[PDB]
């Protein structure tokens, strides 16, 4: 039934096309063997071409299909890349449709969840300026997806982190530390912690962007998930050299971390101890 | 609005029930305040009853709604446990339907992402034998979810980590260190590093299970994400007593650790330096 579904992706009937896309994403959602069967049946050139469709209903199903395929192994992500999905995904970051924007962002984050080569392919496709620009969106769901995409890219090597910094992610992320939306706040904190997980120059860039006052302030958050993300970001910063460690101490982190060693939450006490250990 | 949908979760009409479930999942995915409003409206007893449903679609949706409620604060996760979700969830770990099994594992990993009280509730409900059995699964998608759930349980205190060891998780985790699948290998390394974040007795159990030669070998990985995971597992083992530190040296880690201080990736350099400093 798989070669018939593939043939149905070349159908001009919009209902037949939408049905074939739904059925292929269903097979692609069931593991690496099933994804590979979809790849081997030749679904990818057709899926990639469908990303040029102006119809929202087709685009949503085609993007959902590609993100499920991109949820497999690094070789399966590479197959999506080799079929040329990335230039088409980067173009969809200009889409005025907020639902399409979310799907394209999710597809990109799945590709960026692969190895360092897969992340580099996302950078080389020019995704970073469009991702950073999306951090100005008033749409909370778009913000969350753009932030998750950036945190995946920033989970790569030192050059992948530097690319995120050079595209201007830091001033946008620091501004998002003022967000009243705790879900956006957690995503901004996670993205900063991934950037702060790099070398001394990367950590220094987080400091220079003015992240420390807001990070230390969030260590007092009544929301324990926010507290833990802020603490993780600061612990990564504390991994830096003496200049980075001194900046953390000047921002008032010592008094907060010492106080956190007695906190009710065992995970918080534990991470505060490791952070305080790095600083001294 | 909310009381109506809570009443609709008890409706005899399958469509009115499916729509109420989807609506409840959407509100529950919008942060802690919206989760609290769903709890206050009394959605949990009805959601818990739906875990006994013969309908595959209703089951997957109820598991997804519960995983969203369980993505909140520790007190909100405790509300899911107090409503009696755990015996029904643990039972669903024996499901032959991989779609249901994935959702049940995801719900459990969210509950196990809480404090020691919430993790202990998962252990006391008998989740560990079913999880350990799933480590032998030929389905890579299920194996990853099971490894993630196990790593969350192992993120707790020494009592919770010992329960993971007592369930015979270590021989299954050491066997997975030979996996050609990089995603499975990453998850197995993460589960091991959490177990190794415990006290000397928990670290010695990891050593005795024969993890060190595989961990030492993975320091030669060209995949930086695998390398980092292995470095963190070794660094946690090296945080033990002199007997645990001696085992790492005996396993031949010192040479490669010193060489990795000059690795291209500056974060690898720091992690190798930190590991080597703990040993010396």
């Amino acid at each position: 039934e798989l070669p018939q579904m593939v043939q149905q992706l070349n159908s001009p009937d919009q209902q037949e096309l939408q049905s074939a896309l739904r059925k292929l994403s269903q097979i692609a959602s069931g593991g690496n063997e099933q994804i590979q069967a979809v790849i081997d049946a030749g679904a990818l050139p057709a899926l990639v071409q469908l990303l040029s469709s102006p119809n929202e209903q087709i685009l949503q199903e085609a993007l959902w299909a590609l993100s499920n395929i991109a949820s497999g192994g690094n070789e399966q992500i590479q197959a999506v890349i080799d079929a040329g999905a990335l230039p088409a995904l980067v173009q969809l970051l200009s889409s005025p449709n907020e639902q399409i924007l979310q799907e394209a962002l999710w597809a990109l984050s799945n590709i960026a969840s692969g190895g360092n080569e897969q992340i580099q392919a996302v950078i080389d496709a020019g995704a970073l300026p469009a991702l950073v620009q999306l951090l100005s969106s008033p749409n909370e769901q778009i913000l969350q997806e753009a932030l998750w995409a950036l945190s995946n890219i920033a989970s790569g090597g030192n050059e992948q982190i530097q690319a995120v910094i050079d595209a201007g992610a830091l001033p946008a992320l620091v501004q998002l530390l003022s967000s009243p939306n705790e879900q956006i706040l957690q995503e901004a904190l996670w993205a900063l912690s991934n950037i702060a997980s790099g070398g001394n120059e990367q950590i220094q860039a987080v400091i220079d962007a003015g992240a420390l006052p807001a990070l230390v302030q969030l260590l007092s958050s009544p929301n324990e998930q926010i507290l833990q993300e802020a603490l993780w970001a600061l612990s990564n910063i504390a991994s830096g050299g003496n200049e980075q460690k001194q900046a953390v101490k000047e921002a008032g982190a010592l008094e907060k971390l010492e106080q956190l060693q007695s906190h009710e939450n065992e995970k918080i006490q534990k991470e505060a101890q490791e952070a305080l250990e790095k600083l001294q | 609005e909310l009381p109506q949908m809570v009443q609709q979760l008890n409706s005899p009409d399958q469509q009115e029930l499916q729509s109420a479930l989807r609506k409840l999942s959407q509100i529950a995915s919008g942060g802690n305040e919206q989760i609290q409003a769903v709890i206050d409206a009394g959605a949990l007893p009805a959601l818990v009853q739906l875990l006994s449903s013969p309908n595959e679609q209703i089951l997957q949706e109820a598991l997804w709604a519960l995983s969203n409620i369980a993505s909140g604060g520790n007190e909100q996760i405790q509300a899911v446990i107090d409503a009696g979700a755990l015996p029904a969830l643990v039972q669903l770990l024996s499901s032959p339907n991989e779609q249901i099994l994935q959702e049940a594992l995801w719900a459990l990993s969210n509950i196990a992402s809480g404090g020691n009280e919430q993790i202990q509730a998962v252990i006391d409900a008998g989740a560990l034998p079913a999880l350990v059995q799933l480590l032998s699964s030929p389905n890579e998608q299920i194996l990853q979810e099971a490894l993630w759930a196990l790593s969350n349980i192992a993120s707790g205190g020494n009592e919770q980590i010992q329960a993971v060891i007592d369930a015979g998780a270590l021989p299954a985790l050491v066997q997975l260190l030979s996996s050609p699948n990089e995603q499975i290998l990453q998850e197995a390394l993460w589960a091991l590093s959490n177990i190794a974040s415990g006290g000397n007795e928990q670290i010695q159990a990891v050593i005795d299970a024969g993890a060190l030669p595989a961990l030492v070998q993975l320091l030669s990985s060209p995949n930086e994400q695998i390398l980092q995971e292995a470095l963190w597992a070794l660094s946690n083992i090296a945080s033990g007593g002199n007997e645990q530190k001696q085992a790492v040296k005996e396993a031949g880690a010192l040479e490669k650790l010193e060489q990795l201080q000059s690795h291209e990736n500056e974060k690898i350099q720091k992690e190798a330096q930190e590991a080597l400093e703990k040993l010396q």
Binding site: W64, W148, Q228, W232 | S67, W106, S151, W190, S193
Partner: peptide, 10 residues
């Protein structure tokens, strides 16, 4: 149409 994200803090 279900989206799940997982994150690890050492």
């Amino acid at each position: 149409r279900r989206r799940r994200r997982r994150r690890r803090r050492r």
